[PDB]
Design an enzyme around this catalytic site. Structure first.
Site, PDB file in Angstrom:
ATOM      1  N   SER A  42      23.291  27.015 -13.231  1.00 39.70           N
ATOM      2  CA  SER A  42      22.254  26.004 -13.385  1.00 39.70           C
ATOM      3  C   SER A  42      21.825  25.755 -14.835  1.00 39.70           C
ATOM      4  O   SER A  42      20.924  24.973 -15.072  1.00 39.70           O
ATOM      5  CB  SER A  42      21.044  26.188 -12.432  1.00 39.70           C
ATOM      6  N   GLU A 142      28.990  24.060  -5.591  1.00 33.83           N
ATOM      7  CA  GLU A 142      30.406  24.167  -5.804  1.00 33.83           C
ATOM      8  C   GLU A 142      30.506  24.496  -7.267  1.00 33.83           C
ATOM      9  O   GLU A 142      31.352  25.272  -7.682  1.00 33.83           O
ATOM     10  CB  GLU A 142      31.081  22.836  -5.518  1.00 33.83           C
ATOM     11  N   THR A 209      17.701  29.357 -16.969  1.00 33.51           N
ATOM     12  CA  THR A 209      18.616  30.348 -16.423  1.00 33.51           C
ATOM     13  C   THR A 209      19.700  29.724 -15.531  1.00 33.51           C
ATOM     14  O   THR A 209      19.595  28.576 -15.071  1.00 33.51           O
ATOM     15  CB  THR A 209      17.869  31.416 -15.600  1.00 33.51           C
TER      16      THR A 209
HETATM   17  C1  LIG Z   1      21.646  27.680 -10.752  1.00 34.14           C
HETATM   18  O1  LIG Z   1      22.800  28.068 -10.772  1.00 34.14           O
HETATM   19  C2  LIG Z   1      20.954  27.479  -9.412  1.00 34.14           C
HETATM   20  N1  LIG Z   1      21.466  28.420  -8.446  1.00 34.14           N
HETATM   21  C3  LIG Z   1      22.757  28.350  -8.167  1.00 34.14           C
HETATM   22  O2  LIG Z   1      23.535  27.544  -8.661  1.00 34.14           O
HETATM   23  C4  LIG Z   1      23.160  29.280  -7.229  1.00 34.14           C
HETATM   24  C5  LIG Z   1      22.634  30.556  -7.269  1.00 34.14           C
HETATM   25  C6  LIG Z   1      23.012  31.507  -6.334  1.00 34.14           C
HETATM   26  C7  LIG Z   1      23.916  31.176  -5.345  1.00 34.14           C
HETATM   27  C8  LIG Z   1      24.439  29.897  -5.299  1.00 34.14           C
HETATM   28  C9  LIG Z   1      24.059  28.947  -6.236  1.00 34.14           C
HETATM   29  O3  LIG Z   1      21.223  26.176  -8.949  1.00 34.14           O
HETATM   30  C10 LIG Z   1      22.427  25.754  -9.580  1.00 34.14           C
HETATM   31  C11 LIG Z   1      19.452  27.681  -9.489  1.00 34.14           C
HETATM   32  N2  LIG Z   1      19.046  28.566 -10.595  1.00 34.14           N
HETATM   33  C12 LIG Z   1      18.833  29.875 -10.474  1.00 34.14           C
HETATM   34  C13 LIG Z   1      18.416  30.534 -11.596  1.00 34.14           C
HETATM   35  O4  LIG Z   1      18.229  31.745 -11.587  1.00 34.14           O
HETATM   36  O5  LIG Z   1      18.212  29.911 -12.627  1.00 34.14           O
HETATM   37  C14 LIG Z   1      19.013  30.617  -9.320  1.00 34.14           C
HETATM   38  C15 LIG Z   1      18.781  31.975  -9.370  1.00 34.14           C
HETATM   39  C16 LIG Z   1      19.470  30.105  -8.130  1.00 34.14           C
HETATM   40  S1  LIG Z   1      18.895  28.415  -7.914  1.00 34.14           S
END
Ligand SMILES: *C(=O)[C@](NC(=O)c1ccccc1)(OC)[C@@H]1N=C(C(=O)O)C(=C)CS1
Length: 265
Positions: A42, A142, A209
């Site tokens: 993300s 994805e 993050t």
């Molecule tokens: C960022 O990557 C985020 N989560 C995910 O992509 C994701 C996390 C875990 C499993 C599958 C997908 O959305 C893209 C969001 N950001 C965070 C973060 O810590 O900044 C997350 C922990 C999950 S939501």
């Protein structure tokens, strides 16, 4: 020497670590696996929100975006709660940054246009900033369901840190837009256990993050010393040997941030 410490961290956590802090007038660049590719997860959401800001008039922020319950593909702490009202481009920006909302991001891409749901337009915006390395091919999600060794949706600590540096510390965005982005990252709610945990409380920290499968954990920040000296810190890791279901080690990012702090101190 620094490299040795990072390696120990790598051993201690069964992980691959990538670190980059841009050089300044008084400090050399810090770099460990700075040019190897790591999944955005993300973290793109941050330069995305700047893509959206660069392109349009401030005024554009007030534009209401309508979506449905089926538009919600990924973790959407905010967009899930507003299908009835919809959200301005401003509320989308806010949530894609402060809560990492998967749908808010998916919308803002769209609002960028062109093939790839907006990913070409987004990679277009990275290029515009000198980053020829990074690429966003897929939508949320994805983007964090690729295989280790797959170059789609990746960046480097080197490349993201120079980008972030231009957005917050440089001239990439007019001052008005600059403070919007910066203020949104300062109030990020997802990073308390990362770079921010690894730095003394009297250092100011803003960040965005990223988390994904294969034990992916990222954090990208700009820090200010107690005296006001800014630095850009990019910390990325995955744990491919644990496979798809491998768990992200947040303590890895916090520790690597402490090593970085001691060297900047
Ligand atoms: C960022 O990557 C985020 N989560 C995910 O992509 C994701 C996390 C875990 C499993 C599958 C997908 O959305 C893209 C969001 N950001 C965070 C973060 O810590 O900044 C997350 C922990 C999950 S939501």
């Amino acid at each position: 020497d620094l490299a040795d410490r990072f390696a120990e961290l790598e051993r201690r956590y069964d992980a691959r670590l990538g670190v980059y802090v841009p050089a300044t007038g008084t400090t050399a660049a810090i770099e460990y696996r700075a040019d190897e590719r790591f999944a955005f997860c993300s973290t793109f959401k941050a330069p995305l929100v700047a893509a959206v800001l660069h392109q349009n008039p401030l005024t554009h922020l007030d534009k209401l975006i309508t979506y449905t319950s089926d538009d919600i593909r990924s973790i959407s702490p905010v967009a899930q709660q507003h299908v009835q009202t919809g959200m301005t481009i401003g509320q989308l920006c806010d949530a894609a940054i402060r809560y990492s909302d998967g749908t808010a991001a998916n919308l803002l891409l769209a609002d960028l246009g062109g093939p790839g749901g907006g990913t070409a337009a987004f990679t277009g915006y990275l290029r515009s900033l000198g980053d020829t390395v990074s690429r966003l091919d897929a939508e949320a999600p994805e983007l964090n369901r690729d295989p280790p060794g797959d170059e789609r949706d990746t960046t480097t600590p080197h490349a993201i840190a120079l980008v972030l540096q231009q957005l917050v510390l440089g001239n990439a965005l007019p001052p008005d837009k600059r403070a919007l982005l910066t203020d949104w990252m300062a109030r990020n709610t997802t990073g308390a256990k990362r770079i921010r945990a690894g730095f003394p409380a009297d250092w100011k920290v803003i960040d965005k993050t990223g988390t994904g499968d294969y034990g992916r954990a990222n954090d990208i920040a700009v820090v200010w010393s107690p005296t006001g000296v800014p630095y850009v810190v990019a910390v990325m890791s995955d744990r491919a040997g644990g496979g798809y279901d491998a768990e992200p080690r947040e303590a890895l990012l916090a520790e690597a941030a402490t090593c970085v702090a001691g060297v900047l101190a």
